[PDB]
Symmetry: C5
Subunit: 315 residues, 5 copies
């Protein structure tokens, strides 16, 4: 059900005064008042794709956290029913009030305020995302551990998500900039006085949009650079781990060779430890002779094992 | 062969009474009665893609479990020969009878009933799919086992399948909503009275379709979130298993070092266990001296092995 | 070279009698007799893509094993030079003779015979492919072996190939069905009598083609289901093998712990086996005391090793 | 720099005599003499894509090793400056001279010679590529070795490269065949006499091009079959290697069990080898009793280890 | 903010004298002076895609390191605010001054200078990239090490990046060459005198652009060849490492067999080392008999182990 969702709205009139505070307005009343279309509101209500639409009496903006309807006399900010106003929305409202209470027309000032708020939020989000990755990379320079690699991958996923979001916002602004008739139709005050700019006269809007398109492009480039650096660090860590595993295997082989070398001498001592006739008992040289022979044979076995271990891994 | 498949049909007249109960009607008789086309029925008979088609005297619906033909006076629900009516179909029939026996026209009420049944079935299927995954993830928080990972992957496949099905249904409704002439052609009662709405007057149908498009979109988003969480859990489990394997290898190396350390002292005891002249027999200090020397050499070998094991894996 | 390939041909006249038996006809003579075009024959001669083409005096069919030219009076089946007639071709010829010697026109009966032969061959090939996979899956339920997995993959490749072939045949029939003017141009007997059906009158051909399109679709669906089941079985087998490898590694570690535990007691016995003064000789309690001490120390070492092995793999 | 590259050229007049031998001609002189365009010569000079272009007074061919300009009276073969004539180019020149010195027009004979040379070179290259792979596969049937697998992969890369080259040549001929106005414009002798063939009269060119398109298609199919066979052999070899590794691991485990079984009996003998009171000295049955007990315990330990090894890997 | 960025500019007049040295000019002043459009300057200011644009009174070039505006009387080189002139830019300025102070028009000479500078920079960058890879590949011919493989991959990434950059530059020149009306519009001096070349008269520009397109294509081909060689070397190194690992495993197995072979003889010596009645004491043959028996049994165990090791890995 729920045919009418009773959206939450706030409005500002021509002089910048708060003509209406946070209230509940139906969709039908909003459509009747602003003369909109259901398709435009349905496009706005999607919270995945930003949109900047122009209509012969309105400008519709659905950016990251702003749902704004700008007319030549009124500005409306709306949201879903039951939602509470956040700090960025209050800051945007205060900035819009300050700019409107103070040459540029009304709609251009509103658009400037919206773009300034969006760029500030983008920069703050980028810094908040970027700082822990720098801290982790600083900590990883001393020792290499698998948990740190897992944390690095977890942070890299968030960096990629933010890069995608910033790229989407920049592409929306670029697609608005590429159109020519929309920039001509963005003049509302001259439209009220029956003046048409034409398709060859749009100077202020192009500069105003470019001045923030550049700011978005810088953030996108920086995010891409951070992603590349993270990937390189991960590759280096993996190579180091593989080398460590190979060294451990070689050490185990050397320990096995040593064990065999001791076992041979233990066997020889056991042979002369029997309860039989050795024929060299009660002689002074027997003990030293057998000890030297056993030690020499153990050393020879160890040397042969080490030599063949060196010869095998020569390739 | 089988030129005529003799489809099973049920019909409801204008007053909502059951004018005909479950029966067998040929394809040719159905085409002659309803004035359809073979291509539309062939498109409907496919059980892989949902379809909402409009014709100048009919509305054709092939959703998840409904094959419905809506006219301005009659409603027909049909299925393949030999099939038995299920509980959702009986519930839909009862709901349609209750809504029609009771302002909105006939076809809009039928469409509302169909959409309500489809959304209810989608929500029930989503809950039934979602519950075992939550139970498995709750059980996996204590211990990690490979069989639980296999069960998690098996359930994730079903979640992905349901997400694809819900996405297909939502895309069908969205594609119907985007068209403009179809919404104008959806008025049948006014068409009987020779009244044409035009391409600029369609208000009721747009709201009615949006009110269920939103409900489908919510389910699609929730399924995507569940899939992402499952993937993250699988990655964490794999990392834990790799760390466990490395720890086991290190323990094996330490055991080898201990074995060598004991073997050296065993060799020394075997050297002094021979049946020869030791020159220190019948002396009080010999036993303690040899015992201390063997223990000291074993400890030295163990310490050197542990030190080199620590030094190797420093990188 | 080889400008003229001298294709092998067989022909049947209007009354169904064999007017000509297996013979050698040049390409130029065939083109002059049937009034064809080089492009159509070049399209037919490709043995990778099936084709159903319609021309104002002919129907051209290049299916799996049939190269058929159907006219309003004659039917020709042709093949490459030097080829021998197989059993399916002879069966198709006998069936066509029986159907033509016996309301439906000539070309529709020929098309029915061709489609029946193709569907029968498809079903026979599917059964022959499907049976060994079922046998292998039945044998694999008792024990898991790598050779059986290799055989399963080898059979799965053939199942995928047959699925692709059946999908290609079904897509050809569907693409023929979607066209509208071709179905109007498929009437040759009425074309001889200067009667044109038009673009709104084609009933018999649509039903006739749908009745075999459904039969192809069923086989495609069954092949896809078999492929999915094979993939699931392969995944289960791989998981079982990995678990077996981990269990073997754990058993090896336990054997190493046991070896160390015995080695410690062997060292202690070797210490008291020396030819020196033990100070407890000729006493009754010495043997039992040393035996108990060595056994106790071996058990303590084994218990400590097992406890640390349990503690390491807790994660 | 190098505005004019001074291409190397050879020419043949209408009677087939060598009117000019290998010489250096500028690009501007060639363009002025033949009335060409810079774009066509730039397309020809690329050595990666074959091209068959038709112009109202010329035919331009850039195949594998031929850069040929055919007119109704002259034939020119050109190449880069400083290059030397190879054996295939000399053979093509001799064949062209023999065919022209001898019904078919001039340009069709030149095209026939070019296509014959290209097909002969393709077949020779295919045989030269194919032979070593067959030799390696014959040698690999006795024993499996990693170096042979590396050689097989190295040869498979070359087979894939040749398959791609042959596919490119066949696609060029097919794209020339599909065009209709080009085949009409390929008649130059009739164009000199002011006779136009039209878009419905082209018989000789189609057969002439098809007779070599088939020859290219055969080679492409054979190369694809060889690639598939190589891939299957590689998969079989990898499976065999994995089975060998598993068998080696099992053998190592059995050796460890045997070592433990001997160690237990060595410990028991060491216990009775001490210099204490055994209480069974100077008795006849003691030696046999202890020997039998130690052997029995060693056999019991070995049997238990083998039984648990069998029980672990049952899954 | 920053509506006007105050770009850094340098200018050269018709006679080639430096009419203005490095200065700061606003975007609005540049647009008013040169009669440009905001879209063209926005396209130029992107530093990722090279561009060669033609306008009825200007030529706009944004290559690797040059931002050049060429008119029929003036040449301007510009860059961002705060940047310092580099050595390639100074060399390009000196070369342009030397060429202009000295038949070809003004704009063609400027374009020749720009293309010469770009090709020289491309060749220098290619040589600087190529040399360390050759040095590393020369050093790797003696011994194989993982660090050298890591360095090889690191250098291969840079080679791929340079190949992509050169491919982008070559594609820009090719796309400029393919256009026909742009080459006609590239004549500015004739445009001042009201002479139009037409779409069929452009000879000088085509040759001038081709003479550098070839130079770019050569560098792209050489970079691709280097990348392929690097990949082949990496594959060979990986195969060698795998063979080394297998050889190490076989050596470990042989060491285990030797350890067991010695352990058996040690057990037999321990059996005859006990303090019981051997019944062969005070006999001459006992010592030699037991020594020979123990050595023979150890050799038999070693031989059996080696034989079964050979038999296992036969497949
Ligand atoms: C007659 C001349 C013939 C040629 C001379 C011999 C040339 C090669 C040998 C030197 C023998 C010294 C011991 C080196 C054995 C190497 C294997 C081994 O296990 O030794 C150590 C650890 O064990 C250890 O730290 C010591 C383990 C016990 C050593 C084996 C028994 C030594 C013989 C009996 C000594 C009482 C393994 O680590 P590495 O330091 O890398 O060994 C290689 C360099 N020592
Ligand atoms: C003269 C001063 C020289 C420096 C002092 C030595 C410094 C380093 C050594 C301490 C020796 C104590 C035993 C530690 C050996 C480590 C290898 C080992 O196998 O021990 C244990 C298990 O075996 C065990 O639990 C015990 C196995 C038997 C121990 C080897 C023989 C000990 C010598 C003979 C004792 C009668 C392996 O697990 P971990 O607890 O992690 O070992 C490291 C910490 N102990
Ligand atoms: C004083 C109280 C201290 C705490 C009590 C000890 C608590 C823990 C120990 C029980 C010791 C019994 C032997 C278990 C050793 C485990 C390692 C081992 O190699 O034993 C077997 C195979 O070897 C075998 O089947 C036997 C190998 C030889 C056993 C080692 C020497 C035993 C001591 C000398 C006995 C004459 C390994 O397989 P598992 O059955 O899984 O072993 C774990 C359960 N037994
Ligand atoms: C009282 C009745 C209790 C049940 C009877 C025992 C049933 C199971 C045992 C038979 C024992 C014979 C030796 C088989 C041990 C298996 C492990 C082993 O290392 O033996 C061989 C190689 O070593 C070898 O070739 C020989 C290595 C030395 C053998 C271990 C010591 C034998 C005891 C002392 C003999 C003087 C391993 O390879 P396999 O042939 O596959 O072993 C399994 C079949 N023999
Ligand atoms: C009665 C006739 C029966 C048939 C004759 C026997 C046929 C097969 C055997 C020859 C035995 C000689 C020793 C070869 C054992 C092979 C395993 C081994 O560990 O030896 C070496 C290293 O250890 C070594 O370098 C030596 C390790 C100690 C050798 C084991 C004990 C030898 C017996 C006691 C000798 C006093 C392993 O490396 P490889 O050279 O590749 O061994 C294979 C070729 N020797
Ligand atoms: Mg050991
Ligand atoms: Mg011992
Ligand atoms: Mg003794």
């Amino acid at each position: 059900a729920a045919l009418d969702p009773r959206l939450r709205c706030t409005e500002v009139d021509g002089n910048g005064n708060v003509i209406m505070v946070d209230g509940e307005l139906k969709k039908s009343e909003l459509i009747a008042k602003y003369g909109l279309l259901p398709r435009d509101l349905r496009k706005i209500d999607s919270s995945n794709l930003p949109h900047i639409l122009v209509r012969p009496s309105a400008i519709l903006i659905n950016l990251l956290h702003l749902k704004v309807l700008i007319k030549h006399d009124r500005v409306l900010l709306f949201d879903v029913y039951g939602s509470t106003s956040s700090y960025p929305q209050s800051a945007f409202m205060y900035d819009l009030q300050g700019k409107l209470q103070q040459s540029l027309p009304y709609e251009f000032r509103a658009l400037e305020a919206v773009l300034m708020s969006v760029t500030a939020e983008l920069e703050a989000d980028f810094e908040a995302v970027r700082d822990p990755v720098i801290r982790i990379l600083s900590e990883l320079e001393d020792d290499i551990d698998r948990e740190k690699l897992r944390i690095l991958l977890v942070l890299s996923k968030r960096v990629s998500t933010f890069e995608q979001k910033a790229k989407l916002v920049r592409d929306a602004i670029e697609e608005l900039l590429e159109a020519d008739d929309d920039l001509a139709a963005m003049y509302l005050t001259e439209k009220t006085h029956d003046l048409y700019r034409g398709e060859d006269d749009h100077t202020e809007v192009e500069l105003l949009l470019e001045s923030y398109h550049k700011l978005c492009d810088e953030v996108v480039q920086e995010a891409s650079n951070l992603v590349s650096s993270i990937r390189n660090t991960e590759e280096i860590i993996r190579a180091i781990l593989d080398a460590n595993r190979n060294s451990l295997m070689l050490l185990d082989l050397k320990f096995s060779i040593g064990t065999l070398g001791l076992a041979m001498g233990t066997f020889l001592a056991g042979l002369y430890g029997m309860n039989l006739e050795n024929f060299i008992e009660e002689t002074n040289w027997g003990f030293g002779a057998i000890t030297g022979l056993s030690t020499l044979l153990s050393l020879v076995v160890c040397w042969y094992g080490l030599a063949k271990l060196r010869k095998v891994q020569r390739v």
